[PDB]
């Protein structure tokens, strides 16, 4: 390896080669090549028989401290850990008879990195040491001095950092020990002054929490998941801070809008707020009063903040375009309405205030401040367009639960008597919805995440009160919505659905079919029939079902067949296939089904090789061919056949049974007593 | 010896078991037994060597400290002599060198009394081979503090010669091994890369005969031989190197054998040049046959084999490839790569330039490996395409120009041509591509060697290739073009006499063939030929126009050839020849930028000569058609256009509009505060379309330059100047649509301190109305700016917001602003501002400056960015130098909840804001300071260290001026970048003092403050300023000098040395902390003098405690203005005081703070004039007139109050460029201070004593014994360093400038 390093470094050039060493030479190395404290301490006096000279025990601290982390020999690693533990005990015993916090600030953030590293015996050591000196430092014999703040900032600088995921969950346990011993010892006749007290730690938590860094909110949520086991199981301390700061945890959750799904911050903040909403419904189901309460960030000031303004702030921020906050605020709205002293329900409440506070008042808190330009028909990702799309999605998913529940009606909220802007906004959206490459698909994903919500809204509006059909217009009953529906039915490689995902590709044929079933009961099934009766006809099938199928054509003809195969299978799940394609004026036996079965039977006759996707296509086609009618007697008659297929001559029926052998059997077992 | 330190501490610690103290020595509750620490301490020592070395080296000095109570005086001397003999025996007797043992004995030696005189020729031979040089260097220097005292300098030179560091090497060869007068004039002419005069005046000193004036000792009698060997080695002088290496040991015809193997001093410094030169001479084609037999006769034994295999081995691989046994060479080159890895792994990691000189040979090693592994396949030569791709990857891979010294270039070129000749034998178009590759690589070698000032190495390569360059036409024209470039460049250093004589000879050579039917078909080199001849006629016409008629006298044929092409009608004709040959090529990639810019600069300098034809029609088109392309040299010359168009308004204006409207609209963002200031100036229609274009595309980079240019723009009423105020209204109305940038600036205004703002307004009104109260309505036009910021608690609400400071100040001043509303709003008297001052002394004793939080300006404390409402985009990007990307500048995302005041007069504030890129950026805010001065001088520092990174001799040292950032958002409000972990120089030198040194320095009747003040009284009589006006005629020369030494000698000496030893605590790190401080301080002391900056007191130097390098801040007096306009002038060019000298002991000042200065000044005054142009178009800006300068000087309270009466007209922004151009083009730095003390202190009372002290004495100082003009760099910096420390000067200077420290 080293010879290869020098060979490549030689052939790498001459103007490139000296990039190697010349980074800075002073980044991390010139913090190890400097002193730790100016005036030395720790005079050790090795006792001989008569002399006793003095040895300064600092000059081999920054080499012991580097041996004890990456030694690569467990014969010197345990030696350095034993020497470092004895040296820590000596330097702790010296200062209790010489200020050395400039030594503490560099010898404390190595004890944690030792105490939770890998090895078990150096975990049996340094875990009770750093769990004991927390108990010593959090005592009144060394309270409020500058030495404890070094330990506390050592803990917090542990808890927020790149890559030390074995250490962050240890710093959580240190904060839990800190909180326990910081009320186990300090007495309330003197617990009113400390700037490292409980409430100072809480303000430190919130000032950590509203931070644009990715990690300084993950640190706050790990702190709260470790302190929710306390802060509820004792009294006379709970009703002040965090029962206001629930909104600041929710606002940090809102601030975590576009970090990453794979970071691990949303799963922590959701549990962080839920661990407290499971205690607001254990005491504030009973404890409700106008006591002296503390104001959080945002609300108007008063003398009490009991519950009723929290839900009003929620219902004023349920159209907030930060999605993971919007979901939690709607959910908390539903599980926070039935706790008024009237023991109410949503169905009384929202209409009960809509009758007496203005019809547009519950409109503008749905459309938001983004109700109010053909420069976007070129498919691109200008940051104004994406933010307007986010506003539209907020306006779209606000209604999707209030209409779907029995809280409000449908023609009550919408209609001609209000003159809102969403009904016009979706029609503005449905003009160029179907239309620097590195930012195009970024626009395409957020364009495609809203047509599914449009389809779900069109589904959920009808099937809750089917007497308000005609309040919608007819552009959605025209060649825009019934164009994009045929696009997401057959070939949605056009409107922007890229494949390479796994969520939306799996969620298309669960919403297309439920939308179609939400339209066959609708009176305008005829627009669907007259549109879809033009693309999947018999002549289009026989022009798709060609005469040359198994050759060098890889993508083209098998894809063009599989599109309409998937389309008709979605139709058969929908229960709308005889409302599209009827047979000839004959018996049951659908002529396209008999044609498909005869096609696959006579294809494998020679004039044949195979593949994997060719057999997948053949199995899908032969599975569709039984979905039309009864047809099983024809299938058994096909199976018992005495033909002879010669080859440079086996049976000509066992081959056709032997290839498929699963679709045939699961079709024969679909109907009993007329098969056997 | 690998285990001796562990065994020593084992035996030294075993006997404490028979000692009665193991009685739980912590003896309390939170203990540890005494056996629980001393047992693992010796258990860890026998595993790794470094902590064992530390244990032994501490316990030894502990024992010797404890021995000094008993064991009385007579015995300690014998014990220490025994230990000295033992350590001598150790160093002489050790066999396999161990680094943490050799360092251990040389560490415990250097901390005790008698052990210092160890073995001054065994220390060097041990440290040079164990690769532990820093500690021996420190040991020898500590022995040279507190003949044997000359050989010590020889071995210190031998140590410093191996780790680069050649400046400190030549700093002892002219001060200690000296006292003659050929070594000085040879080392001065080998300091610059001039390796022919210093290798021609060593033979003249080594073949001396008489010399009865003091015969030179045998310390330099061999040093002359060694240095002549080196200065023969650097340039390609092979045959005269073997002779001077072998012809001083034995007889004449070579007996070279065990002669050199015996007397091992003969083996060290005479072998490698010999084998190197013999191998190099064999590599070109001879028989030689003399080192082969010596190698084969030395290929026996252990001593004569285990050194020649251990050290070199690469010459052995080349030699056995020459004898053609390949696997022998393969074994030796594999040992060579293993040897290189073993060498590199032991150098301490911050010892730079040693690692570079080790890293610069792996290319040659892998080239030999590539050649063997190419030739070791039989079917590899079955075609020519492996050879073709081989030649392609060889040609693509060069060592770089300008950063690799020329022996490495010759190594790669010699090995490549030898490999090509061997392949040319082993494989037999094909025999033309080999020759073409050879010739092209040699031409790249010559073009690299011309750049870094190796001209003697250039000329021999020119003449060596010259016989080959006849077979074609393109090769000959490229050769004569390279010759013309060489003779163009090498004539810039020679004086005014020989300049015309050496550039005339590169004219007539070109009359031969590169014209015989070649300049009609090809057109590419057709332009370059005309460029070269035009520049040659430019040089000739520029030469004798400086000194007019004495120069065209001494020469017959030269004068006839000059007058062939009176006495003015030949100069005008030569200028005509230059202009015609420059207009040939423009009418005839990246080659058009040269052809444009030569004509551009020639016509510009001819116009600046002429101001004391159709040239403005040729300047603008030919410049802007290159500025349309990316051209950084043309990018800095835009205000030359904005001056030529103003002073030449008749023609070339619609031309200017038509050219400037068709351009990339992003190459003006650096010059935007000129173009937005030209709006109020007439003829602004040339700059409207580009400004509207940039405010359409990049609307953020024009905001803060527009606020100040719209803060004062009073138009005209003529017909061409009516639409301009509407255009200003158009840009103002289309900019700042969100109303948020104004809120940002308003919040930053609310952040600052108003208590000094009221003081600034008080001095403004008491300086405005106190001349004559006939000035119309100005107090009534300026009182609203006071009343908006201060007054009722509703005016800040209507301006920006409520303040926590206005709650205690605007609420307070309602009971004394009643007097304001009564009389101060309608004052018109200027008779009593003591009423303001008695309230002003109340406004500081009951006030609360510490606002303690961010909540003083709550717009930023609750930011919460939500949508597109003109997001802020943190102030300070858009540097220029290319197309911006306005999406990836870090948008602002939060303000941190902690402010910190600073320690100054004004106490500015610090903010800790966050970026959307998750980092935190700190910054510092300045309330009430104009900052278009510091922004301009940072632009000067950027152009200065853009110059500095192209001279090779400063690029190899890696000299850069470390800049910073300032943003002037509006007037009186700007952001300035704060740096992390830096300490002011005064704070370093004041913390490093011990507890009684500092306290008895501050509070003391004998202190150098109070002694200097009592000296001021006893020479003059009063106790104020004007005592300086009496002192210059109140004391003679030889009294102040002794009185200055007597109070200088009361400060401790080793204070910066103690500061760098307190924090380094590693002998390796101390070296590269001292050296970087010295290098950076040398560079800023020569860069503060070209543009003369004064007021260089203690707190305007900030050092960085992670690598020890100074930063210069607080740019008060920009051009020469500290000695013009202060009452008591200052006369020193920079600050080189006592401590900056006592850091460098025992070396004298000519070692490190001198060669940096010489190379930097040679880098500066060898330019086309970009620094002069940029200083000119800086000083020709109408924003810093006499009013703005006195308003700037009145910001602090101090020595400048009033009393000019002359300087309203004596500002003179042409004489400052005249004087800076003079002391850039060679001027005695006692004459510039003379003239600039005349021009401000003419008809002063004590003017004669000022001009006497600035002149010299002609007894002591070299600055009085030199011509006032026409000097050179080394003598210029010599009299400069003399004037920086002349104790007559420093005895009489300002008491806060701190001359005694």
Judging by beta carbons within 10 Å of its beta carbon (0-12, 13-18, 19+), is residue B1063 exposed, middle or buried?
middle
Helix (H) or strand (E) holding B975: strand B973-976
Q: Which residues pair with B975 in a beta bridge?
A: B925, B967
The distance from CA B684 to its chain's CA centroid, rounded to whole angstroms, is 40
The answer to whether A268 touches A225, Cβ cutoff 8 Å, is yes
Give the minimum alpha-carbon distance from A48 to chain B in angstroms, rounded to a whole number.
5
Helices (H), A36-145: 61-67, 77-94, 101-107, 111-115, 121-124, 127-137
Best to test chain A binding among B397, B413, B919, B993 (most A CBs inside 10 Å): B397
The answer to whether B490 touches B194, Cβ cutoff 8 Å, is no
Q: Count other C-beta atoms under 10 Å from residue B1237's C-beta.
A: 21
Judging by beta carbons within 10 Å of its beta carbon (0-12, 13-18, 19+), is residue A165 exposed, middle or buried?
exposed
Task: For chain A, say whether B426 makes contact (Cβ under 8 Å).
Answer: no
Tokens of A137: 């430092």
Q: What is the DSSP letter of B920?
A: B
Length of chain B: 1301
Q: Please name which of B1269, B1297, B1126 lies closest in space to residue B1204, comparing C-alpha atoms.
A: B1126
Q: Which residues pair with B1269 in a beta bridge?
A: B1227
Q: How far apart are CA A554 and CA B1157, in angstroms?
A: 74
Chain B residue whose CA is closest to A61 = B51
Tokens of B1017: 């009284």
* Resolution value, angstrom units: 3.9
The distance from CA B380 to its chain's CA centroid, rounded to whole angstroms, is 51
The answer to whether B871 touches B891, Cβ cutoff 8 Å, is yes
How many CA atoms lie less than 13 Å away from B742 in the CB half-sphere? 9
Q: Per the CB < 8 Å rule, is A79 touching B59?
A: no
The answer to whether B227 touches B219, Cβ cutoff 8 Å, is no
Q: How far is CA B1187 from CA A489, B780, B1194, in A?
A: 78, 20, 11
Interface of B with A in 821-880 (CB under 8 A): 867-868
Q: How far apart are CA B173 and CA B1145, in angstroms?
A: 15
In three-state secondary structure terms, B385 is: helix
Cα-trace Rg, chain A: 36
Best to test chain A binding among B31, B37, B394 (most A CBs inside 10 Å): B37
Q: Which residues pair with B1101 in a beta bridge?
A: B1112
Judging by beta carbons within 10 Å of its beta carbon (0-12, 13-18, 19+), is residue A29 exposed, middle or buried?
middle
Task: For chain A, say whether B26 makes contact (Cβ under 8 Å).
Answer: yes
The answer for residues whose C-beta is within 8 angstroms of residue B481's C-beta and 6 or more apart is B514, B525, B528, B529, B532
Q: How far is CA A163 from CA A25, A160, B652, in A?
A: 24, 10, 64
| Mutual angle of helices B1170-1179 and B934-947, in 10-degree steps | 170
The answer to whether B943 touches B1175, Cβ cutoff 8 Å, is no
Q: Please name which of B784, B765, B873 lies closest in space to residue B828, comparing C-alpha atoms.
A: B765
Best to test chain B binding among A8, A9, A11, A14 (most B CBs inside 10 Å): A14
Interface of B with A in 328-367 (CB under 8 A): 337, 340-341, 349-350, 352, 355-356, 359, 362-363, 365-367
Report the alpha-carbon angle B449-B451-B456, nearest 5. Answer: 45
Q: How far apart are CA B1290 and CA B1283, in angstroms?
A: 10
Phi and psi, residue A503, nearest 5°: -90, -55
Experimental method: cryo-EM
Give the minimum alpha-carbon distance from B681 to chain A in angstroms, rounded to a whole number.
39
| Mutual angle of helices B133-144 and B1067-1090, in 10-degree steps | 70
What's the per-residue H, E or C state across B704-721?
HHHHHHCCCCCCCCCHHH
Q: Dihedral of CA B823/B824/B830/B836: which sign?
A: positive
CB neighbour burial string for B994-1018, b if at least 16 within 10 angstroms, e if fewer:
eeeeeeebeeeeebbbebbeebbee
Q: Count other C-beta atoms under 10 Å from residue A368's C-beta.
A: 17
Interface of B with A in 788-817 (CB under 8 A): none
Identify the residue whose tokens are 């527009």.
Answer: B706
Q: How far apart are CA A286 and CA A78, in angstroms?
A: 57
In three-state secondary structure terms, B923 is: strand
Give the minimum alpha-carbon distance from A55 to chain B in angstroms, rounded to a whole number.
7
The answer to whether B314 touches B343, Cβ cutoff 8 Å, is no
Q: Please name which of A145, A73, A58, A150 lies closest in space to residue A111, comparing C-alpha atoms.
A: A150
Best to test chain A binding among B58, B330, B1061, B1105 (most A CBs inside 10 Å): B58
Give the minimum alpha-carbon distance from B1253 to chain A in angstroms, rounded to a whole number.
44
How many angstroms separate the first and last alpha carbons of chain B? 48
Q: Please name which of B498, B502, B468 lies closest in space to residue B486, comparing C-alpha atoms.
A: B502
Interface of B with A in 1142-1171 (CB under 8 A): none
Q: Please name which of B219, B225, B216 lies closest in space to residue B153, comparing C-alpha atoms.
A: B219
The distance from CA A655 to its chain's CA centroid, rounded to whole angstroms, is 49
Q: How far apart are CA A286 and CA A343, in angstroms?
A: 12
The answer to whether A624 touches A666, Cβ cutoff 8 Å, is no
Tokens of A436: 């620097």
A13 chain-B contacts, CB cut-off 8 A: 397-398
Tokens of A420: 């809102």
Q: How far apart are CA A256 and CA A268, in angstroms?
A: 11
Q: Per the CB < 8 Å rule, is A79 touching B43?
A: yes
Q: How far apart are CA A90 and CA A85, in angstroms?
A: 9
């Amino acid at each position: 390896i080293r010879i290869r390093v020098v060979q490549m470094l030689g052939s790498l050039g001459g103007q490139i080669n000296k990039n190697l060493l010349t980074v800075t030479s002073s980044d991390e190395m010139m913090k190890s090549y400097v002193a730790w404290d100016r005036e030395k301490r720790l005079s050790f006096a090795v006792p001989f028989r008569e002399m006793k000279p003095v040895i300064f025990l600092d000059v081999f601290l920054p080499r012991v401290t580097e041996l004890a982390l990456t030694a690569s020999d467990r014969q010197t690693k345990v030696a350095a850990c034993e020497l470092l533990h004895s040296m820590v005990m000596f330097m702790l015993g010296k200062a209790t008879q010489p200020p050395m916090y400039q030594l503490y600030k560099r010898t404390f953030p190595v004890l944690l990195r030792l105490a939770c590293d890998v090895d078990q015996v150096t975990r049996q050591l340094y875990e009770p040491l750093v769990m004991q000196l927390i108990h010593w430092f959090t005592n009144n014999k060394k309270f409020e001095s500058q030495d404890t703040v070094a330990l506390l900032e050592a803990i917090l600088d542990g808890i927020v950092d790149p890559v030390d995921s074995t250490l962050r969950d240890f710093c959580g346990r240190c904060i839990r020990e800190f909180l326990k011993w910081s009320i186990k010892q300090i007495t309330p006749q003197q617990q009113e002054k400390s700037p490292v007290n409980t409430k100072s730690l809480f303000k430190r938590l919130y000032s950590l929490a509203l931070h644009p860094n990715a990690f300084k909110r993950l640190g706050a949520s790990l702190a709260f998941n470790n302190i929710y086991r306390e802060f509820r199981e004792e009294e006379s301390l709970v009703e002040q801070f965090v029962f206001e700061a629930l909104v600041i945890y929710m606002e940090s959750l809102a601030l975590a809008h576009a970090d990453e799904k794979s970071l691990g911050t949303i799963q922590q903040c959701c549990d962080a707020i839920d661990h407290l909403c499971r205690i607001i419904e254990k005491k504030h189901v009973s404890l409700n009063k106008a006591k002296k309460r503390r104001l959080p960030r945002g609300f108007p000031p008063s003398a009490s903040l009991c519950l009723l303004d929290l839900v009003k702030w929620l219902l004023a921020h349920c159209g907030r375009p930060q999605t993971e906050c919007r979901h939690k605020s709607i959910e908390l709205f539903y599980k926070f309405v039935p706790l008024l002293p009237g023991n109410r329900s949503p169905n009384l409440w929202l209409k009960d205030v809509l009758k007496e506070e203005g019809v547009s008042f519950l409109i503008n808190t749905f459309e938001g401040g983004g109700c109010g330009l053909l420069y976007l028909r070129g498919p691109f990702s200008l940051q104004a367009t994406l933010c307007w799309l986010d506003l539209l999605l907020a306006a779209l998913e606000c209604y999707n639960t209030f209409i779907g529940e029995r809280t409000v009606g449908a023609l009550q909220v919408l209609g001609t008597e209000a003159q809102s802007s969403l009904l016009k906004a979706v029609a503005f959206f449905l003009e160029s919805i179907a239309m620097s490459p590195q930012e195009g698909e970024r626009y395409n994903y957020s364009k495609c995440t809203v047509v599914v919500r449009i389809m779900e809204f069109t589904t959920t509006l009808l099937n809750t009160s089917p007497e308000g059909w005609k309040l919608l217009k007819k552009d959605l009953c025209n060649t825009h919505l019934m164009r994009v529906l045929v696009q997401t039915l057959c070939e949605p490689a056009s409107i922007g659905f890229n494949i390479g995902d796994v969520q939306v590709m799996a969620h298309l044929p669960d919403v297309c079919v439920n939308l179609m079933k939400a339209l066959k009961m609708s009176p305008y099934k005829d627009i669907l029939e007259t549109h879809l009766r033009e693309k999947i006809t018999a002549q289009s099938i026989e022009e798709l079902c060609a005469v040359n199928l198994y050759g060098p054509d890889a993508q083209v003809d098998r894809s063009r067949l599989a599109a309409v195969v998937s389309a008709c299978k979605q139709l058969h799940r929908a229960g709308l296939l005889h409302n599209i394609l009827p047979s000839q004026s004959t018996d049951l036996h659908h002529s396209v089904g008999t044609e498909l079965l005869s096609l696959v039977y006579k294809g494998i006759a020679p004039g044949p090789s195979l593949d994997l996707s060719c057999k997948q296509l053949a199995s899908g086609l032969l599975e569709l061919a039984f979905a039309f009618g009864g047809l099983c007697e024809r299938l058994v008659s096909l199976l018992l056949n005495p033909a002879v297929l010669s080859t440079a001559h086996f049976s000509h029926g066992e081959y056709f049974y032997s290839l498929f052998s699963e679709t045939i059997n699961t079709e024969l077992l679909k109907n009993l007593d007329l098969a056997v | 010896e690998v285990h001796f330190l562990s065994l020593a501490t084992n035996f030294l610690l075993e006997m404490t078991s028979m000692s009665p103290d193991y009685p739980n020595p912590m003896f309390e509750h939170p203990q540890i037994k005494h056996s629980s620490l001393i047992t693992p301490l010796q258990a860890v020592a026998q595993r790794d060597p470094i902590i064992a070395k530390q244990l032994f080296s501490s316990l030894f000095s502990g024992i010797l400290k404890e021995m000094d109570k008993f064991k009385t005086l007579s015995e300690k001397n014998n014990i220490t002599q025994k230990l000295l003999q033992d350590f001598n025996r150790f160093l002489n007797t050790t066999f396999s060198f161990f680094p943490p043992f050799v360092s251990c004995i040389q560490d415990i030696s250097c901390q005790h009394a008698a052990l210092l005189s160890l073995d001054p020729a065994a220390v060097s031979a041990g440290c040079l081979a164990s690769l532990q040089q820093p500690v021996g260097i420190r040991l020898l220097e500590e022995a040279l503090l507190r003949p044997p005292d000359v050989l010590r300098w020889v071995e210190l030179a031998k140590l410093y010669r191996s780790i680069g560091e050649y400046d400190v090497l030549r700093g002892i060869f002219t001060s200690e091994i000296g006292t003659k007068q050929i070594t000085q004039s040879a080392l001065l002419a080998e300091a610059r890369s001039d390796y022919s005069e210093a290798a021609k005046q060593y033979d003249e000193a080594l073949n001396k005969q008489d010399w009865v004036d003091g015969e030179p000792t045998e310390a330099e009698k061999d040093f002359w031989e060694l240095a002549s060997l080196d200065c023969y080695n650097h340039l390609a002088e092979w045959k005269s190197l073997e002779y001077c290496s072998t012809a001083s040991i034995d007889s004449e015809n070579p007996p070279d054998l065990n002669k050199i193997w015996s007397e091992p001093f003969y083996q060290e410094t005479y072998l490698p040049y010999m084998i190197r030169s013999k191998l190099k001479l064999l590599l070109q084609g001879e028989a030689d046959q003399s080192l082969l037999t010596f190698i084969d006769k030395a290929m026996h034994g252990e001593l004569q084999k285990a050194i020649l295999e251990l050290h070199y081995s690469q010459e052995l691989s080349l030699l056995y490839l020459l004898q053609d046994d390949v696997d022998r060479a393969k074994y030796y080159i594999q040992n060579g790569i293993q040897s290189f890895m073993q060498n590199y792994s032991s150098i301490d990691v911050l010892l730079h330039q040693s690692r570079l000189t080790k890293l610069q040979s792996v290319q040659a090693l892998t080239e030999i490996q590539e050649f063997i592994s190419f030739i070791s396949k039989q079917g590899n030569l079955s075609s020519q395409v492996p050879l073709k791709r081989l030649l392609n990857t060889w040609t693509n891979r060069y060592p770089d120009a300008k950063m690799d010294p020329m022996n490495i270039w010759d190594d790669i070129i010699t090995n490549r041509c030898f490999f090509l000749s061997k392949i040319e034998e082993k494989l037999t178009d094909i025999s033309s591509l080999i020759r073409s590759c050879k010739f092209s690589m040699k031409m790249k070698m010559i073009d690299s060697a011309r750049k870094q000032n190796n001209f003697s190495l250039a000329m021999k390569l020119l003449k060596e290739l010259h016989k080959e360059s006849k077979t074609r036409d393109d090769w000959l024209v490229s050769w004569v073009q390279s010759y013309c470039r060489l003779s163009h460049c090498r004539s810039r250093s020679q004086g005014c006499s020989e300049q015309v004589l050496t550039v005339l000879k590169t004219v007539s050579l070109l009359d031969e063939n590169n014209v015989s039917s070649y300049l009609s078909k090809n057109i590419l080199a057709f332009r370059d030929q005309n460029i070269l001849l035009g520049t040659t006629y430019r040089i000739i016409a520029n030469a004798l126009s400086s000194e007019p008629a004495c120069l065209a006298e001494i020469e017959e044929d030269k004068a006839r050839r000059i007058l062939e092409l009176d006495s003015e009608k030949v100069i005008a004709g030569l200028y005509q020849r230059a202009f015609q040959h420059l207009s040939e090529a423009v009418q005839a990639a990246a080659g058009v930028i040269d052809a444009y810019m030569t004509l551009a600069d020639f016509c510009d300098q001819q116009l600046r000569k002429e101001e004391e034809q159709a040239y403005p029609a040729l300047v603008v088109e030919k410049m802007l058609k290159a500025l349309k392309l990316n051209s950084n040299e043309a990018r800095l010359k835009f205000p030359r256009l904005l001056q030529i168009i103003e002073r030449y308004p008749e023609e070339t204006l619609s031309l200017m509009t038509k050219e400037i409207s068709s351009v990339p609209c992003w190459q003006f963002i650096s010059w935007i505060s000129h173009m937005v200031a030209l709006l109020d100036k007439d003829q602004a229609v040339a700059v409207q379309h580009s400004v509207e274009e940039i405010t359409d595309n990049y609307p953020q980079a024009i905001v803060y330059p527009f606020i100040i240019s719209s803060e004062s723009y009073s138009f005209k009423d003529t017909s061409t100047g009516h639409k301009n105020k509407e255009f200003v209204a158009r840009i103002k109305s289309k900019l700042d649509q969100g109303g948020v940038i104004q809120d940002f600036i308003n919040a930053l205004d609310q952040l600052s301190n108003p208590e000094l703002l009221f003081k600034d307004w008080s001095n403004d009104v008491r300086a405005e109305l106190a001349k004559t109260p006939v000035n119309k309505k100005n107090i009534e036009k300026m009182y609203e700016r006071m009343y908006a910021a201060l007054g009722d608690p509703k005016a800040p609400g209507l301006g920006a917001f409520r303040r926590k400071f206005i709650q205690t100040f605007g609420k307070e001043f309602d009971k004394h602003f009643g007097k304001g509303g009564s009389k101060l709003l309608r004052m018109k008297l200027s008779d009593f501002n003591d009423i303001t001052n008695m309230l002003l002394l109340k406004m500081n004793k009951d006030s609360k400056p510490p606002g303690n939080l961010k909540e003083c300006s709550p717009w930023m404390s609750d930011f919460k960015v939500e949508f597109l409402r003109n997001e802020l985009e943190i102030p300070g990007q858009y540097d220029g130098r290319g197309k911006p990307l306005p999406e990836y500048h870090v948008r602002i995302a939060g303000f941190d909840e902690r402010v910190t005041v600073m320690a100054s007069l004004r106490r500015p504030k610090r903010i800790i804001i966050r970026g959307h890129d998750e980092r935190e950026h700190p910054f510092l805010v300045k309330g009430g300071e104009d900052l278009r001065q510091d922004q301009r001088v940072e632009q000067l520092f950027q152009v200065m260290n853009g110059i500095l990174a192209q001279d090779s001799a400063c690029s190899q040292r890696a000299l850069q001026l470390r800049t910073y950032s300032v943003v002037p958002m509006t007037s009186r409000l700007g952001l300035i970048e704060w740096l992390e972990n830096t300490v002011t120089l005064k704070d370093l030198l004041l913390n490093t003092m011990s507890q009684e040194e500092k306290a008895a320095y501050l509070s003391d009747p004998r202190a150098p403050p109070c002694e200097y003040k009592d000296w001021l009284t006893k020479m003059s009589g009063k106790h104020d300023v004007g005592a300086y006006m009496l002192m210059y005629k109140g004391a003679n020369r030889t009294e102040t000098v002794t009185s200055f030494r007597k109070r200088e000698s009361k400060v401790p000496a080793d204070l910066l040395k103690r500061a760098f030893v307190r924090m380094s605590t590693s002998p390796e790190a101390f070296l590269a902390l001292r050296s970087h401080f010295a290098s950076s301080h040398a560079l800023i002391c020569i860069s503060h003098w070209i543009l003369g900056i004064g007021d260089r007191h203690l707190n305007n130097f900030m050092v960085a405690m992670e690598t020890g390098g100074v930063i210069g801040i607080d740019f008060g007096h920009a051009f020469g203005s500290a000695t013009q306009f202060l009452p008591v002038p200052e006369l020193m060019p920079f600050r080189l005081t006592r401590q900056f000298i006592n850091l460098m002991l025992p070396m004298k000042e000519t070692g490190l703070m001198y060669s940096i200065m010489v190379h930097a000044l040679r880098a500066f005054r060898s330019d086309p004039g970009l620094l002069t142009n940029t200083m000119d178009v800086f000083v020709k800006e109408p924003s810093f007139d006499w009013k703005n300068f006195e308003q700037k000087m009145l910001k602090k309270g101090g020595s400048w109050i009033q009393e000019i009466n002359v300087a309203e007209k004596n500002w003179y922004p042409r004489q400052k460029i005249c004087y800076a151009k003079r002391k850039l083009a060679g001027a005695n730095p006692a004459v510039i201070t003379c003239d600039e003390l005349l021009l401000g202190h003419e008809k002063a009372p004590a003017f004669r004593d000022y001009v006497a002290v600035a002149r010299g004495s002609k007894d002591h100082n070299i600055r009085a014994q030199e011509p006032e003009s026409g000097l050179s760099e080394e003598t210029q910096v010599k009299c400069l360093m003399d004037q920086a420390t002349d104790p007559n000067i420093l005895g009489r200077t300002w008491e806060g400038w701190e001359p005694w420290m």
